[PDB]
């Protein structure tokens, strides 16, 4: 029982053979992932948005009460504030006020990919970085933001008074794996797990991920 399974010989080939290939492997939920798109999973790629987005869904079907946006999410609230993302909840189906929690994956300058985590619950927000410098301007700007998003979709009955903090990770060993560790705090946050996992786990998600597209997981 760890969060992320080893695949077993015939998934793993699956994977091998579709990175090989180097076509469409899914159109579900509207995403569509190519091979294009699959080989960001390859070892020492830079993991791009549509496989982020992937993993968000998959994580919001996958976790009771929980909302996971996708990377375009922080983007348009942080450049349009709360009226560019206005519908955005209501689009889940849901109530903010019915949530444990929203998952909101930051891409910082078209490459650093770090985590935004709010927690309804324990009334917090969380920036979690795997390539964290210690809190800094973007981060808190981020915290800022994700308050507002609480205070104004709630009609502001909530957020106003959740605790902004840098909850600490797991620290990436090179600089490229930014997005499978936001994958993994994703992953074990939604499990309301420790973020103690090491980078032998994180190698074993991009399998994890592929083999979650190849087996068309969002149903």
């Not at 091979?35 to 999973?41: A, E, I, S």
């Not at 994703?186 to 996992?197: E, I, V």
């Amino acid at each position: 029982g760890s969060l992320v399974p080893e695949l077993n010989e015939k998934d793993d080939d699956q994977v091998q053979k579709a990175l090989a290939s180097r076509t469409q492997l899914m159109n579900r939920d509207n995403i569509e992932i190519t091979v294009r798109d699959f080989k960001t999973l390859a070892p020492r790629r830079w993991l791009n948005d549509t496989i982020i987005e992937f993993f968000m869904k998959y994580i919001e079907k996958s976790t009771p009460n929980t909302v996971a946006f996708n990377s375009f999410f922080y983007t348009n609230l942080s450049e349009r504030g709360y009226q560019g993302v206005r519908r955005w909840m209501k689009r889940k189906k849901t109530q903010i006020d019915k949530l444990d929690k929203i998952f909101t994956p930051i891409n910082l300058n078209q490459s650093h990919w770090a985590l935004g985590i709010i927690d309804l619950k324990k009334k917090t927000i969380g920036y979690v970085d795997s390539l964290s410098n210690g809190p800094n301007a973007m981060s808190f700007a981020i915290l800022t933001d994700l308050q507002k998003y609480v205070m104004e979709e709630s009609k502001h009955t909530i957020g106003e008074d959740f605790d902004l903090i840098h909850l600490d990770c797991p620290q990436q060993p090179n600089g490229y794996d930014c997005g499978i560790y936001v994958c993994m705090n994703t992953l074990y946050g939604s499990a309301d797990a420790p973020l103690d996992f090491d980078y032998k786990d994180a190698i074993r998600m991009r399998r994890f991920i592929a083999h979650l597209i190849l087996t068309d997981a969002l149903k």
